[PDB]
Design a protein around this ligand. Structure first.
Ligand SMILES: [Mg+2]
Ligand SMILES: [Mg+2]
Length: 343
């Protein structure tokens, strides 16, 4: 069904490990949850009120409020189970498991996209601003400063008073991981011809952060594949929705830029993080000749994949939105990670 992402060096066995932050070592007592496990279980438990509120007002679901209560109860219980017995529910837990358990409880109860209304609203608002935001980057004369502005836009989108205001209020550099000078140096040779980008959120993120950047790549002669979730997870953009957005924004051009080398791919993913050892054949086919792999957002690029080694150049770019993640990295809440590995 699924296959390894082609830019992972083979053998991936005993080399690729998706999850970045370990919670347990083999020598730890197997019958007692560890401190990191308790910490991270608590992160997920602390998400329950927001997910319950969103679920309960999902009017597309009959008797959403009762179902949302059952979600909050069932997921809270699974999490307390894991604190008492790390081997329960398919543990010991890692970030992928905790994410997946949350999605399963919701989906079993018949929820399919509790964020759909808000996603649609945020996409609509962003689409109205696309020409304005793109104009501002197009106005910048120097190609390297333009890149920097687009990179700041990716970070701002990944948190978003306005999107453009947020571009100007990022934490000051140096960033916690700051490889932008190196990346800019290579970008100005125009040496990349095949970019693959694992996208994250709907709304400003995909439309005002990612898409202008993608457009700049196209303009500089690169092919760009945008890889998105198959299934809804939180407010993350799915392949289906991104196809609709592109149709909406497009002489089939994006503000005078041809999109014949812009491809939208279903990654096969259904979480807010990603295990790159299991991606769709569609994506594997479209990524078999990639020479830049970009992984966006804290879930896909930081909590997973931050230290993943690729056969080609790779960039992990995202804003830090968990204190526990900031702690792990020795950075600030809202710190920016721009981690670039050449060769
Ligand atoms: Mg997201
Ligand atoms: Mg997460």
């Amino acid at each position: 069904e699924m296959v390894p992402f082609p830019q992972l060096p083979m053998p991936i066995e005993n080399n690729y490990r998706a999850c970045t932050i370990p919670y347990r070592f083999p020598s730890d007592d197997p019958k007692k949850a560890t401190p990191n496990e308790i910490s991270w279980i608590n992160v997920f438990a602390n998400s329950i009120p927001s997910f319950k509120k969103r679920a309960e007002s999902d009017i597309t679901v009959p008797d959403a409020p009762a179902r949302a209560e059952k979600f909050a109860e069932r997921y809270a219980g699974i999490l307390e189970d894991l604190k008492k017995d790390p081997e329960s529910h398919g543990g010991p837990p890692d970030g992928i498991l905790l994410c997946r358990l949350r999605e399963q409880v919701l989906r079993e109860l018949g929820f399919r996209d509790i964020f759909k209304k808000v996603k649609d609203e945020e996409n609509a608002k962003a689409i109205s601003l696309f020409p304005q935001v793109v104009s501002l980057s197009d106005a910048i004369e120097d190609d390297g400063k333009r890149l920097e502005n687009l990179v700041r836009g990716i970070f701002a989108g990944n948190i978003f008073m306005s999107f453009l205001a947020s571009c100007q209020n990022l934490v000051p550099r140096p960033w916690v991981i700051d490889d932008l000078e190196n990346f800019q140096a290579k970008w100005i040779n125009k040496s990349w011809k095949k970019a693959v980008i694992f996208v994250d959120n709907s709304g400003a993120d995909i439309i005002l952060g990612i898409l202008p950047f993608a457009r700049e790549l196209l303009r500089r002669g690169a092919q760009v594949v945008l890889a998105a979730n198959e299934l809804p997870s939180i407010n993350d953009i799915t392949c289906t929705e991104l196809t609709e957005i592109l149709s909406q924004l497009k002489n089939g051009q994006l503000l005078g830029v041809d999109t014949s080398k812009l491809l939208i791919a279903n990654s096969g993913n259904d979480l807010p993080v990603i295990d790159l050892s299991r991606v769709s054949q569609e994506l594997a086919y479209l990524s078999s000749d990639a020479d830049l792999v970009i992984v966006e957002g804290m879930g896909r690029g930081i909590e997973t994949n931050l230290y993943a080694q690729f056969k080609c150049d790779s960039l992990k770019i995202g804003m830090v939105k968990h204190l526990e993640v900031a702690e792990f990295l020795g950075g600030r809440l809202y710190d920016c990670v721009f981690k670039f590995n050449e060769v």
